[PDB]
Design an enzyme around this catalytic site. Sequence first.
Site, PDB file in Angstrom:
ATOM      1  CD  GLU A  10      -4.847   7.704  -3.013  1.00 36.99           C
ATOM      2  OE1 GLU A  10      -5.823   7.402  -2.298  1.00 36.99           O
ATOM      3  OE2 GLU A  10      -3.885   6.945  -3.202  1.00 36.99           O
ATOM      4  CG  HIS A 171      -1.378   9.174  -0.418  1.00 39.63           C
ATOM      5  ND1 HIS A 171      -0.251   8.390  -0.533  1.00 39.63           N
ATOM      6  CD2 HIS A 171      -2.151   8.885  -1.498  1.00 39.63           C
ATOM      7  CE1 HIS A 171      -0.329   7.673  -1.641  1.00 39.63           C
ATOM      8  NE2 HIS A 171      -1.474   7.947  -2.241  1.00 39.63           N
ATOM      9  CG  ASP A 300      -3.753   4.746  -5.605  1.00 40.76           C
ATOM     10  OD1 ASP A 300      -2.837   5.600  -5.641  1.00 40.76           O
ATOM     11  OD2 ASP A 300      -3.890   3.923  -4.668  1.00 40.76           O
TER      12      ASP A 300
HETATM   13  O1  LIG Z   1      -2.090   4.805  -2.891  1.00 38.50           O
HETATM   14  N1  LIG Z   1      -1.588   3.721  -3.116  1.00 38.50           N
HETATM   15  O2  LIG Z   1      -2.054   2.649  -2.731  1.00 38.50           O
HETATM   16  C1  LIG Z   1      -0.285   3.655  -3.737  1.00 38.50           C
HETATM   17  C2  LIG Z   1       0.225   2.363  -3.919  1.00 38.50           C
HETATM   18  C3  LIG Z   1       1.495   2.164  -4.429  1.00 38.50           C
HETATM   19  C4  LIG Z   1       2.253   3.279  -4.742  1.00 38.50           C
HETATM   20  C5  LIG Z   1       1.749   4.557  -4.548  1.00 38.50           C
HETATM   21  C6  LIG Z   1       0.469   4.791  -4.059  1.00 38.50           C
HETATM   22  O3  LIG Z   1       0.051   6.073  -3.939  1.00 38.50           O
HETATM   23 MG   LIG Z   2      -2.037   6.586  -3.914  1.00 36.86          MG
END
Ligand SMILES: O=[N+]([O-])c1ccccc1O
Ligand SMILES: [Mg+2]
Length: 352
Positions: A10, A171, A300
């Site tokens: 991710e 996502h 992430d």
């Molecule tokens: O996957 N996330 O949690 C994420 C959080 C904040 C910014 C982008 C992201 O992809």
């Molecule tokens: Mg993310």
Amino acid sequence: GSMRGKVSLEEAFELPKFAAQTKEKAELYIAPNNRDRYFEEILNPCGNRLELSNKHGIGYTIYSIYSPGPQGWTERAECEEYARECNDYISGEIANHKDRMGAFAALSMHDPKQASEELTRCVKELGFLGALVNDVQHAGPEGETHIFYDQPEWDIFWQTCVDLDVPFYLHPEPPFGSYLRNQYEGRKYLIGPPVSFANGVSLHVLGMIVNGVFDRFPKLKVILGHLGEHIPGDFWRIEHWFEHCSRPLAKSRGDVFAEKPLLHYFRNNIWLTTSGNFSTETLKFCVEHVGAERILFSVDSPYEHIDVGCGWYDDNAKAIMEAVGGEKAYKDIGRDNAKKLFKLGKFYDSEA
Ligand SMILES: O=[N+]([O-])c1ccccc1O
Ligand SMILES: [Mg+2]
């Protein structure tokens, strides 16, 4: 002990020519002391984040477009051009590191047939491993039109995913339009991981479930990050309500509904990743419900730090092994589930 060859999937990028756009994301998701590192990582797939990944025992990174990405481009033709530019870009970036980099398709999700063709191009011509789409496709002024993929016209796209036999990573993305103004303007720090992102993803994938998508396409594979976007804690409550209210109510009206219990989909069609959820306790609870074979390590990055996410999994190896059911479960979550799911060849440290 800790393990090498971890798969992490991710991991976001943006087109370098749009570095200015990243600054707005930094305002929403990045503490001031982390700005330099964020801008370096989001714009350089082969830069310091690769050195950190090598250092910290990641063998294979699957890159994807950051959020909202194409899902925030409201003009179909501009969106389609942008998605293609993203896929060509990351294809060129990962070309030089085939032993440790893959990619997910960025897609314009304005039109099911066009998205199907771009996914097919990415998989068949570019070697991509699936799609990563940032929740609903926005359209119209301020993105007020929300395009969901749980409606029947998307069957031609799910058929393509099954034909290519690749997964669809659903996502999160931020709020748009009146939803942003009505419900987030007075609590802007809840945009993102604190509640907004899961709220949207869980709504969408539960929508796929109750609209029968996984009944019509039993071989469809879907991935949710963040240990399932609020759903595992509510596994009991959701299916209970489906038994007590939703399934008989829908049937009485002739309305489509999920044919199987919620857990069946999470044990057959859905995989979870550990992105931004380096929580042994939450991981244990998830394992106890879906099985260790259905959860994949992920970081992430660049919103999370590679050294932090790998640090959790590596430094706490014994405790996590205890939590997830032993050494095989550990290596499975870290690496071998993904190796199997994406049919990975030999890759960096893949047998280390
Ligand atoms: O996957 N996330 O949690 C994420 C959080 C904040 C910014 C982008 C992201 O992809
Ligand atoms: Mg993310």
